[PDB]
Specification:
heteropentamer; A alpha+beta (352); B alpha+beta (344); C alpha+beta (332); A: 352 residues; alpha+beta; 2 domains; 12 strands; 29% helix; 29% strand; rod-shaped; B: alpha+beta; 8-stranded mixed beta sheet; binds a molecule of 10 linked components (NAG-NAG-BMA-MAN-MAN-MAN-MAN-MAN-...); binds ligand PT5; binds ligand PGW; binds decane; transmembrane (chain E)
Chain lengths: 352, 344, 332, 353, 345
């Protein structure tokens, strides 16, 4: 048959081949050209401080032992042949539990050119650590890294390079975005050397720049807190003799702010420093507490336990209580100070 | 005669090169595909994916596996699939998948006299599905499964749906607790990557969400507290404690309902339809409480001034209460009419 | 040893790729099952766990041997050497065999070529639950199996006498359900591959209502009585009765939200939803009754005696509703 | 080399060896001596009614096919040698999902003595069923079993035995305890026979006796309920004209008891019967509700809507004033006394046993 | 360095190699040196009582069977050759779940040297049990250890030692945890008897100190603020019964809810923690404030007509009692805070 020629070629290539030895062992440095096609940038987990990414990871090198002459210029072979030859032992330095997909078959391809050039591509899902600083949360930006290199071979044996110019060697698919509360602004690419106990190794690095979206936390945390502050300040417009009503205002607003403060930190990890949202919630709590203390101060100076009746008349300075000066000043002071605080906060943090 | 079949199979497997596809240097090999859907489960908005169990069957022709003298379609033990070439089919949007393996690997290989091969697997796959929840819970979603060859380009392999539109079966028998499958589609095309062009098949479903659960869970309670907030308009103006407690309880209940409703979903940055409805209800109850506050102010902080000196008129609490009684239900009904007309 | 040479002779020239009697007649498999336990029933995911010992018997002429030894009893080592049926469970979401300390498999071969093959399995099987009568609902969960590759012209299954056995059900992990009984059936199903013999075991389960009585019904009834307590308070105490009404309404809303957490997000009304809705209607009616009483007695100026009528009407109506509800659901 | 003799011995031992056949087949019964060293008794899961245990499980037997003579009395071989010889097919009858540890290599050892004695040990994490009767929860005790035996071999082929006396054949490490809310009182060891349709089998059984610790539930459930009851009883000391205050007391206490009752049944599985804590919560709810009904009855008999002015003296029996309710004065004594009596009876009944 | 010569050398080395036997079978024990590079510590869990650890674990030992002359360089071989050589049966005793990373290939390293020395490297993520004493939680310090041991080989067969002494373990100083700070790490070598023999044991222990800022933000400050809120009742008139009762009841319920919510996110341990004691003290304070209001209300209404007919602070005037409480409650709370924070810090 016509396929017996290729069987003979493949048998000749693997005759005497030793996959335990890299190409050019003891003669030259094996050079591997790598690049990445991100099919989808997975979701970011703030609690675990990590992210997921799905990639076509492809490498290319030269093996003089695998050159041939035949009717075809390039052999596109079954992926099991990749187990019969030497391949680089690339690994992700900051990688957590990762997956090499093998449904239905191993998601790999190997192609051999007549001059001995090997191309080797494989589909991966990588979970990688992204250490985050959350001082400016929920208005923070991050540069999540992705580092890879050889596990066993030092720089004197294996060196990595980008296939094309480094900016163009990491390509993100247009529709490949699984981010919910982040925007992928872009990426930067670099390479370097890392020392360790075993030796010096080449490391290839990418940094993806992410910007958090603020809408969810605006709806979830900021708006309820602002409404609670306004609800607390509403009590200044009631008559001073309605003690139970204003007490109910104060206690309910304080409890609402306490519950919001407790529930606002559920998403994040248990960091030891205060975020921007913590400062906002603390200031709102101070405002509602101040409103309750203002009511207590007003009540301390109330003399008569009965409110004004709709028939009599109050002479100016059966007598009646006068409207509190503290309330009349608070109606102006509290909203104005809250507005000034909001201006300062949203000016300093959004334009940071 | 079992010996003759054994010799025939041994002859077929002798000298068989698994590394080479059928017609390695020849034209591309055509692979037909069909699917029998067993179940769809766990359509998760939090994870943005769905689980799918199926019988996935592939059909092709291998001249090297042709035999004669046995008028039968030889069904063989599935382990022989390890010794034959099969397509390197894969799913791009799959996240986690496996082949069921009890009691043995649920795999089937069947040969025919003319070298035709039928290869079936039982696969459970969790496929990604990005959802647009702007019209949630009155939203329709499109969820797809991509099928592609990894190593073989269009010069080496070709995919087609075996049986045309009947290539996928069992969709009508699927039952989801929260969705109804209104339509499914089959598409065949090509996709180009830096390594070349590859064939692709695509199986898409359109899912429509059921609304009864949210009516029972979310909308009716919100309407109930909104109606309850209007009871304050019938209470006497001097009973400040009762009216204030009623308004505060309604406002806090609305806020708690909104928060606990939004906490069971992904942290999306945009507003949903149900968020709009809950915000409207919050505005209504807040306006009722502010209406009582305005009534109390206009009475107490302005009666002495009016006495010393000397839409409805802004000097009578009874007029304001009657106006609120007339206007609040009407405006709420108008808001409901507009909201339900827009989103349906 | 004699057994060693017997096994070597049996395995000489043996092709495990070919079923016995290939091209002659269908292979008849006799199936047997011992249920160690039926695990929990997960209503959210609509599935249940089951642990079984699964045994299959069939005749293979290639394994005949003549000696004084009547039976060869073998561990898991030789399971991979001979032909084995490709039985699989149709409605299994997830299944697994047991491998510690060794594979939990057993093989036994007789002189006349009869092979018995047994293994231990843990299976998660989907069970579609109709929760209309929840928590007074009963279900019949199946467990189906068949050959994956061999249609009825090649493999046929048979149950034997007293096929399905169950141990002591007291040690089972059924908290919310009680095992009523079981039954077996066999049928033929047509697929694109051909016609296959499917063997099914149905287990009948009935839900136990104690947990939901403790969790949902009693708190709702107690809150309804708490709402009734308002009728004996003086009509002048506006804040107290208003507080009673609003607190009862909010508590009923919270209980309604909590009650459905156990169920899946079904889009139809259950019995529990009906009960909670009626309790909500009762407390809302009580609050509206006080509202109209307060409006008529004071704000405007038989109506004044509304509390006396309510004290009789509300408990009697609630008792009538409870009687009708329980009689309709439990018996009819 | 010096190691060539051992290679020759190992090759000679495996030459003609058939691992498909048990030792002494057709001649006698294979006797296996077993024992267990529990390195740590894992946590108990009430929701799943299971428990975890990490063990060195070791077995010993005799195989005349592996007799040898050489410079060494004992060969301590790699775990991969175990796959080349017959070993018992021991399995756990009530095990659910166990693990054989592989890091860094398979955690097994095989030792062969010159007389042919085999010692075979492995490290396992066994998850096993522990059915529980939670009637006396959280003051309940359990006997969690661990049962194992041969899967394929009947009593006529393989029999198990304990290496030492049965009490001393299951040894728990002193520092190896991972129990949070339980105390391991002790263990009982036994052996017996089980019958199936395939034959009779030997079963080796252990029973670990566990007792629950009540401190967590005392801090979590009992104390809040007691304080809620006391808070409800505090309402009797306010004047009868403070209707909103006493109504708030009653409503808040009732709702707190409802919330506590709902949240109590979260640690346990959804069992269909009532536990001791359920009875305690029910009685406390009854006390709180009775306090609310007491307030309602008191309010029913209040005539004047105003409280005492603070200056006028009431007649011994002008402006009159309501007298102090007799129902309040008697309830102040009645309610705490009955609650204390109930607490005495409950705690004595559920702790004396 | 012709590749054919290297292939011949490797084939000669692996010809007649008995993997079943250790390098000095029947001879003296083989010494195995060890060292670790800690990449990260991920999830210190109080609920599960375990911690996750990612590391590069390297072992060093001499095998005379693998000595080779000729080629003057160290042969870094493909990792699959590890399946054909003898390696130590090292394991971790307190491990619950572990795996070797396997992307793109099995992250394993085999390096041979001319004198027969072998360097064997793995990248391991391991979850290890750590029983934590939470009596002083969240002001607690924990000790978490990794116990390395030989399974099948006694002290007559294998000996362990930390290669490089105290410099064996590296990268601890670079670790950053959100809740904890690593104060110290220690290395220990020991022998352990198991009734099948005496085995060598290495132990790597870390000491972790918890960070307090999260709990100050989350737990202590709300409790202090609620306790301060409860004192507002003393500034309201005795006759305003509804306001004072609502204030006290609200504070008591909030304290109880905070305590329950905090305790529902931790293991069901039987003993009392420091945070539990603080919250119980705050609960006692707010309960005493509510009881103070109840006492003054009783003293006025129940016992006023009796004294009218008849005719520490003085327990006859409610105003005196309120004035006394206004001073005593903050002072007692400050004293309690001082005692608590001096004891637990
Ligand atoms: C995608 O990639 C995936 C990974 O990359 C891939 O998964 C892997 O696929 C392979 C092949 O399909 C699987 O291998 C099969 O596994 C069977 C056992 O399976 C279960 O057990 C494994 C772990 O198995 C080890 O542990 C058990 C005990 O726990 C031992 O009994 C095993 O021998 C084996 O040994 C070691 O490990 C122990 C602890 O781990 C050590 O203590 C011990 O010392 C050993 O070192 C689990 O991982 C499995 O989990 C999964 O899979 C199931 C589905 O099946 C899932 O549901 C689940 O969630 C898990 O994901 C599972 O629990 C093997 O029995 C089997 O090998 C037999 O058959 C083949 C032929 O098919 C033979 O070639 C082979 O030699 C084996 O046969 C001999 O032994 C059997 C049993 O005794 C005999 O019946 C038989 O006749 C034969 O006897 C002959 O040879 C003997 C040789 O020694 C001789 O001694 C005898 O005397 C006799 O002559 C096969 O290896 C593998 O499990 C998958 N998973 C992994 C993680 O690798 C997946 O398939 C890929 N998907 C696709 C679509 O491509
Ligand atoms: C980050 C949040 C910031 C929020 C925004 C801040 C906002 C801050 C600003 C808000 C507005 C502030 C206004 C305060 C200024 C007061 C001057 C005007 C009133 C005034 O003079 O105050 C006095 C007492 O003085 C105080 O103790 C009053 C002084 C103490 C005021 C304490 C206020 C408590 C709240 C402050 C903030 C919080 C404090 C607590 C801090 C802790 C929590 C954070 C009370 O004045 P009055 O009007 O209440 O009472 C009159 C007055 O006593 C007359 O003398 C009396 O008549 P005569 O007896 O005949 O003389 C009237 O009786 P009749 O009814 O019979 O006619 C009374 O009705
Ligand atoms: C799980 C175990 C729980 C154990 C709980 C604790 C269990 C142990 C607790 C035991 C309860 C404590 C003490 C029992 C009470 C003693 C009965 C005393 C009856 C008694 O003398 O009360 C009467 C009538 O009351 C009734 O007929 C009606 C009296 C009904 C009886 C009291 C009901 C108390 C609430 C019971 C709720 C039970 C609810 C059960 C629900 C089911 C739970 C399973 C009202 O006495 P009063 O002092 O309130 O009113 C007087 C009275 O009406 C005078 O006649 C009237 O003077 P005149 O009109 O001139 O004759 C006064 O007017 P002035 O203000 O102008 O001076 C009134 O002020
Ligand atoms: C949020 C609420 C805050 C309220 C706080 C208010 C502050 C005042 C309370 C301080 C409590 C101090 C902590 C209590 C102790 C912590 C709980 C505790 O560990 O006690 C165990 C025994 O309990 C037991 O017998 C359980 C039985 C004792 C039950 C204790 C409640 C007594 C109720 C009496 C009725 C009075 C009615 C009066 C009404 C007028 C000790 O056993 P032992 O070491 O051997 O381990 C064996 C094994 O069972 C685990 O303990
Ligand atoms: C099949 C859809 C049933 C939806 C029921 C909705 C009931 C709403 C009651 C207010
Ligand atoms: Cl995201
Ligand atoms: Cl169940
Ligand atoms: Cl425990």
């Amino acid at each position: 048959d016509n396929t017996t020629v290729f069987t003979r070629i493949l048998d000749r290539l693997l005759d005497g081949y030793d996959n335990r030895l890299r190409p050019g062992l003891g003669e030259r440095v094996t050079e591997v050209k790598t690049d990445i096609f991100v099919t989808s940038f997975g979701p970011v987990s703030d609690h675990d401080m990590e992210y997921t990414i799905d990639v076509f990871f492809r490498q290319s090198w030269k093996d003089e032992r695998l050159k041939f002459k035949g009717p075809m210029t390039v052999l596109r072979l079954n992926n099991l042949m990749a187990s019969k030859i030497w391949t680089p032992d690339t690994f992700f330095h900051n990688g957590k539990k990762s997956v090499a997909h093998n449904m239905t078959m191993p998601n790999k391809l190997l192609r051999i050119t007549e001059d001995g050039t090997l191309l080797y591509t494989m589909r991966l899902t990588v979970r990688a650590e992204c250490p985050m600083h959350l001082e400016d949360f929920p208005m923070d930006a991050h540069a999540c890294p992705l580092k890879f290199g050889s596990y066993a071979y030092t720089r004197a044996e294996v060196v990595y390079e980008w296939t094309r110019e480094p900016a163009r060697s990491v390509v993100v698919a247009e529709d490949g975005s699984r981010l919910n509360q982040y925007d992928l602004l872009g990426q930067t690419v670099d390479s370097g050397i890392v020392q360790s106990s075993t030796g010096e190794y080449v490391v290839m690095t990418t940094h993806f720049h992410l910007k958090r979206k603020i809408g969810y936390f605006v709806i979830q945390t900021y708006l309820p807190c602002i409404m609670t502050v306004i609800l607390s300040q509403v009590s200044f417009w009631l008559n001073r003799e309605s003690v139970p009503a204003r007490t109910v205002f104060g206690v309910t607003t304080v409890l609402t702010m306490t519950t919001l403060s407790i529930s606002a930190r559920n998403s994040l990890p248990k960091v030891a420093y205060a975020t921007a949202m913590d400062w906002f919630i603390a200031v709102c709590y101070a405002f509602v507490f101040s409103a309750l203390i203002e009511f207590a101060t007003v009540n301390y100076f109330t003399k008569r336990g009965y409110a004004w009746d709709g028939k009599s008349v109050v002479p100016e300075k059966k007598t009646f209580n006068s409207v509190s000066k503290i309330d009349r000043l608070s109606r102006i002071a509290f909203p104005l100070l809250f507005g000034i605080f909001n201006l300062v906060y949203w000016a300093t943090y959004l334009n940071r | 005669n079992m010996s003759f079949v054994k010799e025939t199979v041994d002859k077929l497997l002798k000298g068989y090169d698994i590394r080479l596809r059928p017609d390695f240097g020849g034209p591309p090999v055509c692979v037909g595909m069909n699917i029998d859907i067993a179940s769809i489960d766990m359509v998760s908005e939090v994870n943005m994916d769905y689980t799918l169990t199926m019988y996935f069957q592939q059909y092709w022709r291998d001249k090297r596996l042709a035999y004669s003298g046995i008028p039968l379609n030889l069904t063989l033990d599935n382990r022989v699939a390890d010794q034959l070439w099969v397509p390197d089919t894969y799913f791009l949007n799959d996240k986690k998948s496996f082949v069921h393996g009890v009691t043995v690997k649920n795999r089937m290989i069947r040969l025919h006299p003319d070298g035709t091969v039928l290869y079936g697997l039982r696969i459970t796959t969790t496929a990604a599905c990005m959802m647009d929840l702007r019209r949630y819970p009155l939203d329709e979603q499109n969820c797809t499964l991509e099928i592609e060859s990894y190593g073989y380009t269009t010069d080496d392999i070709e995919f087609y749906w075996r049986g045309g539109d009947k290539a996928v079966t069992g969709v009508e028998r699927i039952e989801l607790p929260q969705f109804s499958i209104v339509e499914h589609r089959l598409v065949s095309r090509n996709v180009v990557f830096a390594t070349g062009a590859y064939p692709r098949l695509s199986l898409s479903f359109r899912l429509k969400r059921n609304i009864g659960y949210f009516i029972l869970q979310t909308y009716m309670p919100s309407i109930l507290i909104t109606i309850l907030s209007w009871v304050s308009f019938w209470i006497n103006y001097d009973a400040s404690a009762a009216r204030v407690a009623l308004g505060i309880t309604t406002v806090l209940t609305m806020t708690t309902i909104n928060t606990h409703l939004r906490e069971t979903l992904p942290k999306i940055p945009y507003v949903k339809a149900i968020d709009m409805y809950l915000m409207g209800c919050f505005v209504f109850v807040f306006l009722a409480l502010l209406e009582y506050a305005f009534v109390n102010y206009i009475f107490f902080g302005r009666g002495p001034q009016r006495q010393k000196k000397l839409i409805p008129d802004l000097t009578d609490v009874n007029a304001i209460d009657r106006w609120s009684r007339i206007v609040f239900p009407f405006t709420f009904s108008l808001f409901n009419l507009v909201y339900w007309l827009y989103y349906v | 040893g004699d057994v060693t040479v017997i096994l070597n002779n049996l395995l000489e020239g043996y092709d495990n790729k070919l079923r016995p009697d290939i091209g002659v007649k269908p292979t008849l498999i006799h199936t047997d099952m011992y249920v160690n336990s039926i695990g929990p029933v997960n209503a959210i995911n609509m599935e249940y766990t089951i642990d079984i010992f699964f045994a299959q018997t069939w005749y293979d002429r290639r394994l005949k041997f003549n000696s004084t030894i009547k039976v060869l009893r073998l561990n898991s080592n030789m399971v991979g050497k001979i032909w084995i049926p490709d039985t699989f469970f149709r409605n299994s979401k997830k299944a697994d065999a047991h491998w510690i300390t060794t594979p939990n498999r057993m093989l036994r071969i007789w002189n006349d070529g009869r092979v018995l093959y047994t293994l231990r399995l843990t299976i998660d099987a989907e069970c579609q639950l109709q929760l209309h009568n929840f928590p007074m609902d009963e279900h019949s969960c199946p467990l189906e199996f068949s050959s994956y590759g061999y249609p009825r012209e090649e493999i046929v299954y048979q149950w034997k006498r007293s096929s399905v056995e169950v141990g002591d059900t007291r040690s089972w992990r059924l908290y919310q359900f009680s095992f009523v009984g079981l039954r077996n059936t066999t049928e033929v199903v047509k697929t694109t591959s051909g016609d296959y013999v499917v063997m099914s075991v149905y287990f009948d389960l009935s839900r136990r209502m104690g947990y939901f009585t403790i969790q949902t019904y009693i708190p709702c009834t107690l809150i309804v009585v708490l709402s009734w307590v308002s009728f004996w308070i003086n009509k002048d105490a506006v804040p107290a009765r208003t507080s009673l009404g609003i607190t009862t309404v909010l508590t009923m809303t919270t209980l309604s939200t909590i009650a459905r957490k156990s169920l899946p997000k079904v889009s139809y009304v259950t019995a529990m939803d009906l009960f909670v809705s009626v309790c909500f209607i009762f407390v809302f009616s009580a609050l509206v009754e006080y509202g109209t009483l307060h409006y008529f007695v004071s704000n405007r100026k038989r109506i004044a005696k509304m509390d006396s009528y309510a004290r009789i009407f509300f408990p009697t109506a609630f008792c009538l509703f409870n009687l009708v509800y329980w009689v309709s659901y439990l018996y009819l």
